[PDB]
């Protein structure tokens, strides 16, 4: 029972290490699991003369995270061959909030490209430059209106019951 | 005399429930520079006022300019390097 | 029974990897599966001189996600032969409110192509350019109206009951 | 406009990082009788001379 | 005389539930320095006033300047080294 | 190459068409509804 | 007349049909695989094929929210049907 899980984890660790090795500018791999909150630790030795970018480490991180049940990317750590803890997901502070800059940059780049593509035919291919600053609303925002039509006028009222007693003594 | 009256009403009701999108463009500020030329061989000379007015309008329409958002647009004419 | 499950899962992983290997510009693949929080990871080594687009990665993530029960495509990751996380939903901050931008691009592109196609026969093949900026409402929006026809008029009202007492002493 | 290396700019970004919620709850005024919405009304008018 | 009046109302209501963003720009301060030159071979002589005004406008628009936030911008001209 | 997901069920088929041909939109539905109705649920 | 732009690559082909003909469904795959292969690093999904009057032969798809763009395809189909009807009633 216990040794079964031990063998399975130890074999899949070597399996994912072999897969990670076949990733181009990487020389050797070593994946380790924590299986009872799950976590993973990978020690990747990149090939001399290359360095993965910040959006490139997320590749291997979520490769080993989604190869394992119940493991979010955040518990996966990676260490280079000389220090360089390339995974700052332990903080997990601005990971959601640094994609906002990417989205805003995409928006302003699209508007800038549209301005250049509409204005170049008139003034020339390189006789125009535009820079766009887009402020964005990232605040979650709900609203529940509830409007009632006024029925003060007797000609637009809708009655369900009416008890009208009139007395008069002279 | 007496006049008692009890009335029960049925009222029109509208329940509009909105969940706003995350990432809308609150405000745009666009700066555009246009190069001098206006001549095949002579000295560069500022583009005419009507022309600059039409580039201003074209970039206003391409931006999606809206006074409600408080968008700002500034186009200037100056020689390049 | 635990050996049964591990060998069956490993056979499924190898079989699926072999199937996505015969995918043209894919030299070698490696499926990793986790059914305890379902999850899956693929390491595709594309044939040299090619790159699969985002919709081309949607194909494979739907292929390997539906091959095992209970696994959504969102828990399936792909990694290229040099990092290059091909699925946006990995670092799921939002990663889908950026699809609104390309949807707007599609809308503006269709309107632009329509204006170009209608105006080309008159002024010439390349004598006109049009740029379209589309503001799109991406907000969820519900409404529940409730209209009541007024019955203040006596000749239009509808009566279910009526108790009318008239007394007069002289 | 001014050249490739004839301008330098430095920017300071004062940013807010405080988690900030808010729950507004607005009500329309119904003081005016011509815009009020009545569900019930009991009006007794007695008068003796 | 007497006048009793019990009136029950239905009231319009709006409920906005906002969760503000974490990382918004409260205020921006920008300092800009431009260079002297202004001639083909002569000594540098300070960029002209209207040109300075339009550089200030362009950097104001590229900043996203909004006096509501209290943004501040300062552009000066001085020879480099 | 047909694959099943049998514990909500699902199916994944990797069809390799012969060179010089391409099934139409209502033609993929043929194999889709074949493999869908070849499995219960 | 094929135009390329390599700074995320993309391509735009505007085929000029011979008078009185139109490509079949299996014919656009030929040209898409021809234009995709003859350039290194350009996927077949980035090239857009356009006929002599609209009629985008190579469509675009969505990964994340693929429901709202199916509305776009439906609108394109309705517009194409009405356009074809107008053309086939006005050509004689």
* F7–chain C nearest CA distance, Å: 6
Interatomic CA distance for residues A94 and C93, integer angstroms = 10
Total beta-carbon pairs less than 8 A apart between chain B and chain D:
42
Interatomic CA distance for residues C137 and E61, integer angstroms = 27
Q: How many Cβ atoms from other residues are within 10 Å of residue A40's Cβ?
A: 22
For chain D, positions 8-27, list CB contacts with chain A under 8 A.
Answer: none
Counting Cβ atoms within 10 Å, is residue A9 exposed (0-12), middle (13-18) or buried (19+)? middle
Cβ neighbours of A135 in E, within 8 Å: 64
Write the CA distances from A63 to A89, B35, C32, C71, integer angstroms: 15, 49, 9, 16
SS3 E77: strand
Secondary structure (H, E, C), chain A: CHHHHHHHHHHHHHHHHHHHHCCCCEEECCEEEECCCCEEEEECEECCCCCCCHHHHHHHHHHHHCCCCCCCHHHEEEECCCCCECCCCCCCCCCCCCHHHHHHHHHHHHHHHHHHHHHHHHHCCCCEEEEEEEEEECCEEEEECEEECCCCCCCCCCEEEEEEEEECCC
| Cβ separation F14–C68 shorter than 8 A | no
| Cβ separation A137–B32 shorter than 8 A | no
Total beta-carbon pairs less than 8 A apart between chain A and chain B:
151
* B51–chain D nearest CA distance, Å: 20
| Cβ separation E23–A144 shorter than 8 A | no
Counting Cβ atoms within 10 Å, is residue F9 exposed (0-12), middle (13-18) or buried (19+)? middle
Kindly state the helix (H) or strand (E) to which residue D10 belongs, with its residue range.
Answer: strand D7-15
Angle at CA of residue A33, ends C81 and C42, nearest 5°: 25
Name G5's bridge partners.
Answer: G10
| Cβ separation E9–D37 shorter than 8 A | yes
Cβ neighbours of B2 in D, within 8 Å: 44-47
CA C23 to chain centre: 24
Return the exposure string of E14-36: e unless at least 16 CB atoms fall within 10 Å of the residue's CB, then b.
eebebbbbbbbeeebebebebbe
Cβ neighbours of E21 in A, within 8 Å: 100, 137-139
First to last CA, chain G: 31
Interatomic CA distance for residues C1 and C31, integer angstroms = 22
The candidate with the shortest Cα–Cα distance to B35, out of B1, B77, B3, is: B77
Cβ neighbours of A129 in E, within 8 Å: none
Looking up tokens 């999606």 gives B64
Q: What DSSP character marks residue E1?
A: -
Interatomic CA distance for residues B11 and D38, integer angstroms = 8
First to last CA, chain D: 93
Interatomic CA distance for residues G42 and C74, integer angstroms = 26
**Is the Cβ–Cβ distance between A9 and A35 less than 8 Å?**
yes
Interatomic CA distance for residues G66 and G59, integer angstroms = 13
Interatomic CA distance for residues B68 and F34, integer angstroms = 55
DSSP symbols for B12-49: -EEEEEEEE-SSEEEEEEEEEEE--B-SSSS--B---H
CA C40 to chain centre: 19
Cβ neighbours of D37 in B, within 8 Å: 11
| Cβ separation D41–B6 shorter than 8 A | yes
Name B72's bridge partners.
Answer: B29
Angle at CA of residue A101, ends A99 and A103, nearest 5°: 70
Q: Measured between CB atoms, does E81 come within 8 Å of chain D?
A: no
Return the exposure string of G25-59: e unless at least 16 CB atoms fall within 10 Å of the residue's CB, then b.
eeebbebbeebbeeeeebbbbbbbbbeeebbebbe
Kindly state the helix (H) or strand (E) to which residue E55 belongs, with its residue range.
Answer: helix E49-63
Name F13's bridge partners.
Answer: F2
DSSP symbols for F1-41: -EEEE----EEEE---PPTT----HHHHHHHHHHHHHTS--
Cβ neighbours of C21 in F, within 8 Å: none
Secondary structure (H, E, C), chain G: CEEEECCCCEEEEECCCCCCCCCCHHHHHHHHHHHHHCCCCCCHHHEEEECCCCCECCCCCCCCCCCHHHHHHHHHHHHHHHHHHHHHHHCC
DSSP symbols for chain C: -HHHHHHHHHHHHHHHHHHHHSSSS-SB--EEEE----EEEEE-BPPSS----HHHHHHHHHHHHHTSTT--GGGEEEE-SSS-B--TTTT-SSSSTTHHHHHHHHHHHHHHHHHHHHHHHHH-SSS-----------SEEEEE--------STTT---S----------
Domain hosting A50: range is: 1-88
Looking up tokens 């010439």 gives C124
| Cβ separation F5–C69 shorter than 8 A | yes
């Amino acid at each position: 029972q216990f040794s079964e899980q031990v063998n399975y984890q130890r074999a899949l660790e070597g399996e994912l290490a072999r897969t990670i090795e076949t990733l181009g500018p990487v020389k050797s791999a070593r994946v380790h699991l924590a299986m009872p909150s799950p976590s993973a630790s990978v020690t990747v030795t990149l090939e001399p003369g290359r360095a993965l970018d910040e959006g490139q480490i997320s590749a291997v991180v979520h490769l080993v995270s989604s190869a394992v049940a119940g493991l979010p990317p955040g518990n996966v750590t990676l260490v280079d061959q000389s220090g360089h803890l390339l995974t700052q997901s332990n903080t997990s502070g601005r990971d959601l909030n640094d994609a906002q800059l990417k989205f805003a940059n995409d928006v302003e780049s699209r508007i800038q490209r549209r301005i250049e593509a509409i204005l170049s035919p008139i003034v020339g291919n390189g006789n125009v430059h535009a820079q766009v600053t887009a402020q964005l609303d990232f605040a979650n925002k709900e609203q529940t209106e509830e409007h009632y039509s006024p029925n003060g006028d007797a000609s637009k009222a809708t009655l369900r019951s009416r008890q009208l007693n009139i007395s008069e003594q002279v | 005399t007496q006049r008692n009256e009890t009335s029960n009403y049925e009222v029109d009701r509208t329940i509009r429930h909105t969940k706003m999108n995350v990432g809308d463009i609150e405000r745009l500020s666009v700066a555009v520079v246009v190069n001098y030329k206006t001549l095949a061989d002579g000295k560069p000379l500022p583009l005419t006022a009507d022309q600059m007015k039409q580039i201003e309008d074209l970039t206003r329409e391409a931006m999606g300019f809206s006074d409600k958002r408080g968008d700002t647009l500034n186009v200037v004419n100056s020689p390049f390097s």
